[PDB]
Design a protein around this ligand. Sequence first.
Ligand SMILES: O=C1C[C@H](NC(=O)[C@@H]2CCOc3ccc(Cl)cc32)CCN1
Ligand SMILES: O=C1C[C@H](NC(=O)[C@@H]2CCOc3ccc(Cl)cc32)CCN1
Lengths: 304, 304
Amino acid sequence: SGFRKMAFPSGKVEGCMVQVTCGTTTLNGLWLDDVVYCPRHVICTSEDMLNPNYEDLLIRKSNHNFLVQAGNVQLRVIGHSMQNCVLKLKVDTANPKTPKYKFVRIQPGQTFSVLACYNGSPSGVYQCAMRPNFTIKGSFLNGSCGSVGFNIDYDCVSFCYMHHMELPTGVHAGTDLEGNFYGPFVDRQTAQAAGTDTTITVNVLAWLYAAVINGDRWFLNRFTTTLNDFNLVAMKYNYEPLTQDHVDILGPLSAQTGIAVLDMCASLKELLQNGMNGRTILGSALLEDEFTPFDVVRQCSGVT
Amino acid sequence: SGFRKMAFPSGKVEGCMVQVTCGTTTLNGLWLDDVVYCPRHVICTSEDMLNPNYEDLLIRKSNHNFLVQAGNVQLRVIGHSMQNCVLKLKVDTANPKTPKYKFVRIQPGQTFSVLACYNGSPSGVYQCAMRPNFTIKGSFLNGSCGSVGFNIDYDCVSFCYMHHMELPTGVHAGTDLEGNFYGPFVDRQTAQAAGTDTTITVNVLAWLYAAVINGDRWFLNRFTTTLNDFNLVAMKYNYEPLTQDHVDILGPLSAQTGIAVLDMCASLKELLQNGMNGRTILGSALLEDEFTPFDVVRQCSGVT
Ligand SMILES: O=C1C[C@H](NC(=O)[C@@H]2CCOc3ccc(Cl)cc32)CCN1
Ligand SMILES: O=C1C[C@H](NC(=O)[C@@H]2CCOc3ccc(Cl)cc32)CCN1
């Protein structure tokens, strides 16, 4: 028993991290097979970031201007190309530690692990959610760009995120591994509105099921609700509307606990209306939304 | 910016995990050099756990009864010995992936990363603290025994914990890598009192400094206090007494923020007396105590 904000083991991703330098800018790259993926703003100086013309900036760069270092050894760059907001540096050596991998574009509300890196070196790993507004609340300092987010299914690493920037609000924005930003963000140093963030309702319900499985049950009540009644409450509290698709994904947890999804919704409704009254759920005094129903099943069943 | 409950990258530890089976019991082992370390209760059946005589049980076991599997390959056991509550299985092959390592016995209030494993396979990594009462609030299911806790300083892994059991209260108990339990716990299936847990005051203060650095400042007040006045409040709220050693360790954070340690104590005093009034600090509605002053400096400076 016990419930923790668990990240995937990061080893398969640590073996892919490299340092990419172009001019005076250094950031992290992802080496998979004979390609190194990194944010295209590696070609910018601090002055360039205000209004960069990436096509024009990249034209002043040759293969030899991209310095790629994997640990202590230097990689030979034989090709370079821009795909959306990422640079793909073709190298002459395939990464011997390339795990089985896929590039995936995750949905808002889905979770993933982030391996924070600096100078191609891993410093830490944490679990987070892609917010409904397509930002992530990470922990990233200067030099963290190019750090990646991922999920792991047995031996296959699904890379879903590459870090690019921190908004003036302190939240983070990035791309998928094809270089397409999540959200309306652009890779420019300009004021960018993230938009209203909402709570991931299906994740809060999943976490409430995790709480019941692990013994925290004080919040269970004698009430029930309907999807429409629940959603009137969810709208007032900036929770995303719960759909029958969300109810269906909660099915296994509803089956394991014997608590109907709509009864759990009534517990959530009462918690939203009355607060926790100084109490905690799984060591938290707020409603946690960074665990998907899949994460709860996985952690409660010990999938390796 | 941003502050997360970050674990160390787990790769160096993933390369050490093995599966150990003895009879019908399977758990995780740690393979370092030519030795595999695992909980001695691997030799027990469920019936044995009520009142085991480990010396007598181990006498019925030979090297060939210990099945050690590293991924798909079987290790040859050439020696076995019990050291406190751990078994040391000498194998004929040194682990080629053995990182630079040390065995350390951490202090209560110190933090570490846990690589949760099942059948010698890693499932997740999370950061936690050794509670003042020498328990850990983990996430461990059946088969997780032998999973280890560790810290990483650049290339050196300091193993500090090996998981052994879950108390009837749902908290976890284990040993250092010499097999000495943290706390008064014994490796028997009997009711075991963990004792009063207290909040790690120096860690809460460190996390309050992390909050100020990262922009959350609403809790800063116009007050100050003394160590003695603060400790009267800490005693009432089951916080561990703050000493001048704790103040000294907060020195770098006090220097970076320009907020005197005793002024931060007065903020903590007011938070303890008045609560958060529905507000949050670093995305938490409670006072977080699982970040040491070292963790806050490390995360705020990007140590890899
Ligand atoms: O998460 C981080 C990264 C951050 N660095 C950026 O955000 C750069 C510099 C600012 O101007 C910009 C503007 C756009 C882009 Cl894509 C990057 C950047 C430093 C602190 N933490
Ligand atoms: O963290 C865990 C581990 C736990 N297994 C034990 O606690 C075993 C069996 C119970 O009786 C005992 C009693 C003592 C010892 Cl050392 C181990 C054990 C299963 C659930 N999660």
